[PDB]
């Protein structure tokens, strides 16, 4: 039921990143993968 | 550089220059996408350089530095997939063309010339101990 | 310029929490001086 | 040559500002920063 | 990731992250429908 | 194109000559240090 602000917030940890926003592509892959991780985590989880 | 070069070859029914005369208008719209952007930046850190509503009342002032962090990220993750999609890639496959086009040229050489040599070696290698056997036939020859 | 002008953002902000932080305490102290509450929340005539 | 320059070479290079930047805390002036922005604004007005 | 990567190579008169990014409207309406059917068992599950 | 039919007729040409050649050197060395095997065949049955 969230926003798209609320999406990119939650998932990827906008404010916990290093302080002044990196635009390195890294950083989004770094981001994306700890998100990945977090929702594999989750659907073995939800398969208990 | 490509003009009448020896590297110009034939690859999807075409030749290598006219897949760079193609990206043109990628190109062109990418740069005029990014033309805005930069103008409308440009505005907006020389309007606000010393403003009330850059040093705001209280001295923490971190809620307005969030929001803009948070858009400021929406508006890269959106710019990767723009950029990705309008000029990188079209870019990127002509190139890769061209690196396979001399990466295949090489190691063909490389494999023609590994061929020969070592043909050459077995042919030598096989003679000489055909002569070795010559010696072993004149001796036992010679002997009796 | 990309990682100079992150720097520069990384100090500002720093900076910016250190005086939140002190000032929040001082008035809190400041607070504290007319009416004291004890730990388990009662008021304190002795330190009132 | 060949034109490597948009492909292949190390997937996250310092040359583009696609590789990351460990940052710590040090103060450059906001003329600091202009005067940074404006040397490439020069660069840029041409086709801006 | 496959950003400049000596991994994104030429595959079916393409490379790979096009692929990638065709994915997009595929996901977007897989995620619609299953968004769709989570609310409903949410509520049933709620009011009952 | 015609340099490229050219050029394919030309190193197909080249390279039959070349398998026909290297063929025809194993072949006759083979059989020739076999006519020295015969040699040594014929010396060590004679001397005995």
Known sequence: ?48 | ELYENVENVNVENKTLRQHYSALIPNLFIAAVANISELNAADAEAAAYYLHWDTDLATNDEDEAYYKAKLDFAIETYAKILFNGEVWQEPLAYVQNLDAGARQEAADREAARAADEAYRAEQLRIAQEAADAQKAIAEALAKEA | TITKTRESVAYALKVDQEATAAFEAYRNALRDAAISINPDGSINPDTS | ETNPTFNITNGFNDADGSTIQPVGPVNHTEETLRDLTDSTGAYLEEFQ
Do not use: H, K, M, W
């Open chain 1, 1 to 48: 039921n969230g926003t798209v602000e609320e999406i990119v917030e939650a998932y990827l940890q906008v404010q916990a990143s290093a302080d002044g926003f990196d635009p390195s592509e890294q950083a989004a892959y770094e981001a994306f993968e700890a998100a990945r991780v977090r929702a594999s985590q989750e659907l073995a989880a939800s398969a208990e």
